[PDB]
Amino acid sequence: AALTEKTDIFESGRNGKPNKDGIKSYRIPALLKTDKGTLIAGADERRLHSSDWGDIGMVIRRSEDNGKTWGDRVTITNLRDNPKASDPSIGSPVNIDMVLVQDPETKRIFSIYDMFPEGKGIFGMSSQKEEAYKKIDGKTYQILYREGEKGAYTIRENGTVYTPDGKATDYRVVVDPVKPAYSDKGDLYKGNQLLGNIYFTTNKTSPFRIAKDSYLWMSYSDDDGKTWSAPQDITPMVKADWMKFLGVGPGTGIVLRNGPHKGRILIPVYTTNNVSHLNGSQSSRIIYSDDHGKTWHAGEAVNDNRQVDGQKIHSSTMNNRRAQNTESTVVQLNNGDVKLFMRGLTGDLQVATSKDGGVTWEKDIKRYPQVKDVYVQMSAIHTMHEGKEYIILSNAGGPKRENGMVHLARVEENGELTWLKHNPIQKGEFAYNSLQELGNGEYGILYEHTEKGQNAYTLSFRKFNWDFLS
Ligand SMILES: [Cl-]
Ligand SMILES: [Cl-]
């Protein structure tokens, strides 16, 4: 066989029950082959149910034998639940959806993922804007709102809470968490007494909360994924004042390997606006770093100044369901161009092109009727075989989220894509997935599937070779 049997990396419970570890659900795979040869498999650990909210931790497992066996779960981040929440299913600050990538110069490994305070995830965002940050004297601070008060408190040096007028208080935020899984992050103290947590939004025991908005956090590892930094809040570097949601397109990001922007880290993200939010404004873009992950910047949206049937749209003002593009996967070609394969609503594969290292996008989105898109996440990777350039892309074959496929395209000298093969890899339920090159003509994939009553989803791994592809 040219495809290995299914190995289950993150096992969900069955028939609506928790698994042996008390966890009902895993979702949202990310797969990363590191410079040491290690495979890191990431996921949402969704304890209480399968929905995009609740008690969710960012977790990884490591394989040191190319996916044959796997080590213990390592929790990158898991924010503590609000013990007073009326409904535990929506009673925790939330992390959800990660992107993994390694810097090939520094060997640092990044996991970038979404964060929401307590509530129904994205559906817990305030209906009206709540400002999340304020710049005071050239310094950007996260805002806190106090019960019964209108003004903006700020979290400054060492987590000290300042009044809206600019005076220090005896309140302090845990900004340098030290507990396992960093479960103490956001804890709110008055002197030495723990009062609550700034991410709690109901039945609060402390006076302070952050804006009910959408955030982006990053954790990094310098030891091949064994241990992880405390979360860094990168939101203010990349989130514009008009953006409602800003979140990752989960999977595995890339580092540009050629051209004037060689070394740039690219992370797929997408946004919504306040005009049409999730109904008509989901828009793909990337964020990037040119300094090995220290600072981040937003590129333009594919939808910015995009002409749709003779009239331009902009990601900040659009209201057009079919012009949306959401979670995406990013690839650089040998000619230096960046290709962004975007989940969307045309039924087929949508691809944007950037000639400037991901910052701006060409006028036209290219569609490939040869590859179905049933409106679900996908992953794609660059690969060379026998001196020829290809892209491998995996997603559901359909008609529903089912029949996982690995699609093989030749990259032409145009550089257009020619779809050569469409190979089934998993019968039955199939959703989010993440591909990696393993070396020696082999490839790995971590993907969502269920069978035999499993809760959505169990994340499984398979390896295949060139023979399987071609
Ligand atoms: Cl609280
Ligand atoms: Cl239009």
Author numbering: 321 to 790
Task: Quote what the paper states about this structure.
The 115 kDa NanA is the largest of the three sialidases and is anchored to the bacterial membrane. Although recombinantly expressed full-length NanA was soluble, it failed to crystallize; therefore, a 56.5 kDa domain that retained full enzyme activity was subcloned.
The purified enzyme was crystallized in 0.1 M MES pH 6.5, 30%(w/v) PEG 4000 using the sitting-drop vapour-diffusion method. The structure of CNanA shows the canonical six-bladed β-propeller fold common to all sialidases. The two monomers in the asymmetric unit are related by a noncrystallographic twofold axis, superimpose with an r.m.s.d. of 0.39 Å over 470 Cα atoms and bury ∼1200 Å2 of surface at their dimer interface. The calibrated gel filtration suggests that CNanA is predominantly a monomer in solution; however, it is possible that full-length NanA may be a dimer on the bacterial surface. The active site contains the usual catalytic residues common to all sialidases: three arginines (Arg347, Arg663, Arg721) that interact with the carboxylate group of sialic acid, a nucleophilic tyrosine (Tyr752) that is proposed to form a covalent intermediate and its associated glutamic acid (Glu647), an aspartic acid (Asp372) that acts as an acid/base and a hydrophobic pocket that accommodates the acetamidomethyl group of sialic acid.
